[PDB]
């Protein structure tokens, strides 16, 4: 029963790998994240883990830029997220040096997923316990990808991950529309986050980033306050 | 061995054959392709609020929103060195969240040029502005650097140093600094590209963001 | 038990249990089908990634192009299939660079199966849980169709199926396949019938064909209109047959 | 309880993992080899035939060089790896030195490669056994056998695989100097030896023939059925 | 051949020797010992040598995760133009050849 | 020892590349409506062509699209700068059209990969200091394919035994062999 | 090597069915093995660190017992947890600062040093051969453009910046006290910061302090060098609280 639960390089008699399921379980117990791909833009939102007045508000961030046109967010464990972010930045710089043009979003997702697939087929290591949401603008067309702890990636129109993500996906299915604007996408993302906050939502405990034809940027707290007041 | 995994970097698989071939062609009297070289005049000064770089005609390379470079020698070498240093500085700024410092670029360029024992062959004039003020350097192909208030390189170097040692004063304004650089460049050649970096056009308190490029 | 914890252990009757457990991972994946005819080869797959909030930004899923003359389909673990497909492309390009001729179809399969066998031979690693179907054309044997499994075995076929509910599909193909007297249209109809039995809408299947025109190989992926036409033709002929 | 590791001896001096690899060998299809005055014959049983399969890709007889060929019993991927290594070695040796490769030399190379994989706990042995035949430079026929442990011997007629003991006993009874006088008699002897365990003759029997200074020849079903018919006719005549 | 061939071949080894000597002189015998233990431990979890590895942990430990050199953009080892047989390369890695 | 000469000219929605024939191949096709011409040592030309084809095939399989002339120039520059200390004896010339816009492009590189992009013409080969002034004298903008072929043929011919010219259009590619009377 | 141990809480590289790392959680419990607590507070133009000093043996030289360390000329530190592990991390931090100075030509910042240490700590939690250190670090310094800085890293590889923080046996009560004080008032002078830190310690631990039982280090804008106070200064501050 438990003989096949401890080793990463051991198949179960039914042909299953259990440590990967447990890494996904680690991912599913993290803070919620939301991504919505609208017309002419993409939005990423997340819930902060430093909910106190003692924590400094400009030290560590969960929404990060990789290039001028690529951004990132996660659910799971932060220490793995940092090293993955550093490697992604280096890969993008290498691609620019070799080909003299910015890397496409899909190629970067493929390279990161290739790095993540390793650590699931060797003994003496453990997989990364983190999932990523990747957004980008390329050739006048927005993108939104998700990458798993096992190294598999998907292309989405709207998704949620973290705690209470099944109800979030149901909410998105009910609310998502094809012909949507970026402002309405931001409104819908904040409303989706609000469904499971368990507290009072302010601009000091959520983080929002957007991507459009001008590049990726992270919203300032005053803009988030203005958006929250409009609800 | 043939079973060893491959590695990256430069390749040295044609040196002996190339030496024999150039010897034979020189003895018999035939020509071979050559590299492209640039030897025009480059100059730069330090004034009260920034740096002014000049060249005669781009030839002024981008390193950072606050750092620029001018090169003389083999064109491919200068291009490759400047691009590599620019990428490294962008990685550094993304990690740190701040605009870089001129001494960091000077250190990286000097170390990388010294690593290759002068075979790269790029002479550079580096200048920029950071939180500690404006700085100006001169880097040589073997890896030696000088910190000076005014530098020049190229073909008409002496005709520019004459003007500099004749009409240079500390703490000048922008306009006459540009004029002095223009005269110094024009003296050597006997149509000029100028780059001006000012501390008042840069914000050192705002968090760093990737430039348009 | 005591003999099924590593890939480098033989059971007292000479069995490797970890390899069999790895091959057990292919029965959960989607169905893949392959049919050989006189003037082309066929590949039909089942789409598992079906959902309203999914995007379509790629050439296709579970069908990949390896070079100018070959294509493949996968079933199993996606992250391992990605590595295997990249390695296949590298092997083909290396052979072309060295010999200035395109690689034969069987040599590519052999070269990948060697890699798959090494990971069962050496300890501390995990075998790939991937099974592949290959189609192609070359000047030595013409149209071809191969199959591969996690242990590193392969073989040539005229019609085969991998994935979920493979045995029933194999039985139907054995019953309905005519050797040496089938064309691309007959192969398409048979594939539609077999998939309909084993699993129907145009959004749940993907079909690719290979053919030769003017001394050049053409690889295509069928469209929604053509798939719907095939489905409705099958439905109408089935209704006509059952009405009598 | 001393069979969990490759390099562990039992209290009475046995290595059990190598014996388990031999057990894996003992479950393959039967293979028979006979060497004669001027000919060597190899025959392999076909376990089952699927109608929707291309039979060219599942053959158990290969050609390592122009003067040597091999048959095997056991796991198939391991056999393919060993065959490729031996072929590359033959090509490299022929390129380096123009002399033809010796059958004993290639047998020793294969046995050394097999024996290398029974020395460490980080890798497992090859679960195959091979039969090697060929002609030397002077035209002397040879026949060798290899084992998963790394040993090898020389024979006049041998069988490996499932149901090998009965075939070996039949060969011991029937192998005489007047039964290998001619190529047809040698081929008939091989077919008759294979017919002890094969359910239906000709239908699922594969046979190869090699003559001196000639390439390897694979007999077709027509010739196989003709030989089987001749055997049936002589059996009917001897019935009485 | 060229004077730069040997220098570029063994750059990392010479850098390691210099840093280890300086560290031993300044702090003591324990610091290079710990560094070598860590390097050996992290350099042991990789793909089989005929496939392409990433060396993420080794780059994190060594500090090469925010630097790009000429060995990262020229003659990319991932798209190598020659590769041996898998078993032969694995055997050569273990010293059997 | 002979290295030959290669030129490329640009006109109105068209581009041409020419070389001298009679002995080896110098102009190679890299995809549709994109060519590269190499002049120099016989073995280095073929080696560079084969390695470039290797890289181009891998790139096009992985990316899923057709390459652009600028990206091809960057790849050639990287491949040439790899051998910085012992270099290849080649001087590439690139001419082609944009696969999605159909806009002409011409450039040339040195033996280590320093590019030069122009708008009228570009010349390579050992005798690169003689066709220059003739090219300025005989070139004017907004030139139809027939006059473009005539101009490039004249410039390639009356400056030095036969020549070969490719004319690239959005619809078709025309190849001609010439010999002075 | 030796070989891992079966079980959901006996090896570093094994996830539990809920996705937890019990060896990391157990390494977090080694910080309380010492029995001491420390407090760091950030002011308007200064930063202080305070920790308690326990000398139970009469035959022990009290001048050799300390938990305050100097990394560079402008960076200070306080360590909580296992003593040998703390000293090893201090040595590693000094080495990393030296490498940064050599490589970049200027002195390392506090956040960059903390990030480097956290990156090194993350690797120990993903490999089967090495084990995490049972200690936590708190760093203070003065930034040229930003000002006072307070940073902390833990055995898991996680780091953050604070306005006030605590570590040790009684971290939670200190955190509550500091949260109340910060929500009440800001803009503390140099005197008020030391007052607040000593008051937090002396209220969380119901003790009236002597100058020989606490250890105080400070950094300030006027004098950006890390400094360690003396008994006379500590007693002056203590009587200032007492009056």
Short mmCIF file of C-alpha atoms in Angstrom, two decimals, chain A residues 4 10 14 18 52 56 63-64 67 85 90 125 127 134-135 137 158 170-171 173 198 218 225:
data_model
loop_
_atom_site.label_atom_id
_atom_site.label_comp_id
_atom_site.label_asym_id
_atom_site.label_seq_id
_atom_site.Cartn_x
_atom_site.Cartn_y
_atom_site.Cartn_z
CA UNK A 4 5.03 2.95 -3.63
CA UNK A 10 8.75 3.91 -8.57
CA UNK A 14 -1.74 0.41 -11.49
CA UNK A 18 2.18 9.30 -6.27
CA UNK A 52 0.00 42.52 8.88
CA UNK A 56 7.13 46.10 4.68
CA UNK A 63 3.92 39.30 -9.50
CA UNK A 64 7.21 39.57 -11.40
CA UNK A 67 10.91 40.59 -20.09
CA UNK A 85 12.12 33.20 -12.02
CA UNK A 90 18.44 34.14 -17.98
CA UNK A 125 15.72 15.14 -5.47
CA UNK A 127 9.84 18.03 -7.64
CA UNK A 134 2.40 33.12 -17.55
CA UNK A 135 1.03 35.99 -19.64
CA UNK A 137 1.75 39.94 -25.69
CA UNK A 158 -9.45 32.01 -17.85
CA UNK A 170 -17.27 27.64 -11.86
CA UNK A 171 -17.64 31.38 -11.25
CA UNK A 173 -17.36 29.76 -16.46
CA UNK A 198 -12.53 35.49 4.29
CA UNK A 218 2.44 45.95 -12.06
CA UNK A 225 -7.76 51.31 -4.51
#
